[PDB]
Design a protein around this ligand. Structure first.
Ligand SMILES: [Zn+2]
Ligand SMILES: [Zn+2]
Length: 129
């Protein structure tokens, strides 16, 4: 839940937590794209009011994305880092708010924050290319 346990990375080329292996920038960007797609697949949980399922899935995706986007930003050119970091921060705010909506079992807030998350994912994907 929210914060993952970081396990050892591949060589160079606790209760209720997910596990994360750090990846190199190229592999991190690919994993980010996957995790983004998976986030948008939580709509099924919102519609069926499956709140724990929504929270657990979202937390797994958010755990990877947060880490992977940091990795990606670190390898980007100086002149591109701040924009991607702002887009990423906005995305995490909407993800955190969607989690919040699930905690309080609010369909209206969940739909609101899911809609924002769609837009925010798209902006990040456009930078990843
Ligand atoms: Zn819906
Ligand atoms: Zn609220």
């Amino acid at each position: 839940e929210a914060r993952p346990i970081v396990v050892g990375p591949p060589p160079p080329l606790t209760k209720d937590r997910f596990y994360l292996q750090p990846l190199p920038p190229t592999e991190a960007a690919q994993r980010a794209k996957v995790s983004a797609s998976e986030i948008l697949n939580v709509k099924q949980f919102i519609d069926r009011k499956a709140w724990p399922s929504l929270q657990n899935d979202l937390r797994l995706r958010a755990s990877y994305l947060r880490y992977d986007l940091k990795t990606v930003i670190s390898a980007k050119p100086k002149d591109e880092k701040k924009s991607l970091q702002e887009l990423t921060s906005k995305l995490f705010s909407s993800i955190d708010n969607l989690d919040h909506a699930a905690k309080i079992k609010s369909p209206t807030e969940a739909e609101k924050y899911y809609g924002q998350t769609v837009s925010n994912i798209n902006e990040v994907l456009a930078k990843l290319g």
